Design a protein around this ligand. Structure first.
Ligand code: 91G
Ligand code: GDP
Ligand code: MG
Length: 168
């Protein structure tokens, strides 16, 4: 079966680890060590086709370094996560998109924009703001809550669909 290398990126504390652990283990982690970067494998059925997901949950801060850049080029799709109560993390999406474009030779890289923590009432990044940014990039936007699990599988599966569309 096909294996998809997915890379979860975004600012510190947006929910990268919580999203990933909800996908893999189906529980919510409150204090997953912010410095720990690990990969997880999971077999899933998407649109009736079984595949293997190979998911990197990023945590390191280093950039513009040959080794990390070479590794990130191997990512086939990127889950670009911000938190809807963290304006800075939304603004950082530009930086993450630029890093993906910098390291990937391809001009069209599978990406999904994820606005996480949608269970919270204090929302400083509007749905429309994020939808407009996703429309500018031409990529899907998904609102998620790792806490309640809303949209978690949909975000990852949407990214796989974006890779399948790119490879075809
Ligand atoms: C809690 C700690 C945590 O989760 N993280 C992960 C994200 N981190 C991170 N920080 C930065 N800082 C640069 C300052 C800046 O201007 N902004 C907007 C944050 N840079 C990161 C870069 C990358 C990254 C690096 C390379 O080399 C390639 C590449 C390709 C595609 C996507 C990202 C990258 C990563 Cl993975 C995380 C970065 C802070 C700690
Ligand atoms: N309310 C809420 N809290 C979340 C959500 N996702 C993550 N968190 C919390 O925000 C903090 C940072 O999450 P984490 O996944 O460790 O962030 P990372 O640095 O991006 O890996 C932790 O306390 C999580 O429990 C969410 O969807 N809703
Ligand atoms: Mg983490």
């Amino acid at each position: 079966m096909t294996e998809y290398k997915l890379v979860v990126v975004g600012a510190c504390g947006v929910g990268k680890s919580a999203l990933t652990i909800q996908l893999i283990q189906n529980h919510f982690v409150d204090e997953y060590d912010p410095t720990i970067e690990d990969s997880y494998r999971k077999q899933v059925v998407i649109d009736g086709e079984t595949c293997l997901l190979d998911i990197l949950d990023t945590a390191g801060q280093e950039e513009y370094s040959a080794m990390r850049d070479q590794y990130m080029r191997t990512g086939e799709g990127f889950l670009c996560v911000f938190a809807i109560n963290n304006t800075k993390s939304f603004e950082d999406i530009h930086h993450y998109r630029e890093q993906i474009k910098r390291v990937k030779d391809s001009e069209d890289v599978p990406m999904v924009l994820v606005g996480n923590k949608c269970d919270l009432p204090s929302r400083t990044v509007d749905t429309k703001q994020a939808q407009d940014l996703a429309r500018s990039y031409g990529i899907p936007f998904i609102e998620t809550s790792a806490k309640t699990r809303q949209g978690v599988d949909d975000a990852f599966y949407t990214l796989v669909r974006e890779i399948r569309k790119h490879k075809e």
